[PDB]
């Protein structure tokens, strides 16, 4: 597993060709965005509920989204 510190590199890893899926985990005091690539599961950790919702619209349209529960 790899942790992406920034938001800008998360968009490139989601826009990779080998990004099989993206999944959103909604727990307390944290929002987790996980992109399943060929080698690693890249995780973006957001502790801002406003930026989580705008990024959720800001995902690329060609990627398959699985909102976890």
Partner RNA sequence: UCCGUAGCGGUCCUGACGUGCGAAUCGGUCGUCCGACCUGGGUAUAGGGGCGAAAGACUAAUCGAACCAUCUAGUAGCUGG
Partner RNA sequence: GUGCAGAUCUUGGUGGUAGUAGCAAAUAUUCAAACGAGAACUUUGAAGGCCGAAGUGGAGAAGGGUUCCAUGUGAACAGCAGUUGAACAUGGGUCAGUCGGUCCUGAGAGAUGGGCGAGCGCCGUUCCGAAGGGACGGGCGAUGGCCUCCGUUGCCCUCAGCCGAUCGAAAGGGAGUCGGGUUCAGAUCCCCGAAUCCGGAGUGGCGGAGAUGGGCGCCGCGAGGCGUCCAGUGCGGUAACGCGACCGAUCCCGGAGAAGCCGGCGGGAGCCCCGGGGAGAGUUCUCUUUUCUUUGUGAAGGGCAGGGCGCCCUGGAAUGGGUUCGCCCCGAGAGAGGGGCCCGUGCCUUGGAAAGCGUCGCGGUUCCGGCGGCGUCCGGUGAGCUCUCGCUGGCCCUUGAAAAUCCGGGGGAGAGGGUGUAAAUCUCGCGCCGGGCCGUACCCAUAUCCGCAGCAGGUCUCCAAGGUGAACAGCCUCUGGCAUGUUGGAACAAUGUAGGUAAGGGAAGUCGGCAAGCCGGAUCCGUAACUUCGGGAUAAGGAUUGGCUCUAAGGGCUG
Partner RNA sequence: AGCCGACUUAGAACUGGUGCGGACCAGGGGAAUCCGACUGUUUAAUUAAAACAAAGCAUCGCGAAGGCCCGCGGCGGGUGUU
Question: Which residues between 1 and 40 bind RNA (CB under 7 A)?
Answer: 1-3, 16-18, 23, 25, 27, 30, 32, 34, 36-40
And the tokens for 65? 């989204």
What are phi and psi for residue 22, nearest 5 degrees?
A: -130, 140
Q: Per rule CB under 7 A, is residue 68 in the interface with RNA? A: yes
User: For residue 30, which of 48, 14, 42, 43 has the smallest C-alpha distance?
Assistant: 48
Residue with Cβ nearer RNA (40 or 58):
40
Contact residues for RNA (CB under 7 A)?
1-3, 16-18, 23, 25, 27, 30, 32, 34, 36-41, 43, 45, 68-69
């Amino acid at each position: 597993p790899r942790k992406i510190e920034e938001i800008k590199d998360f968009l490139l890893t989601a826009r990779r060709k080998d990004a099989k899926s993206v999944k959103i985990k909604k727990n307390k005091d944290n929002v987790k965005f996980k992109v399943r690539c060929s080698r690693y599961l890249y995780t973006l950790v957001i502790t801002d509920k406003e930026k989580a919702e705008k990024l959720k619209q800001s995902l690329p349209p060609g990627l398959a989204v699985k909102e976890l529960k």
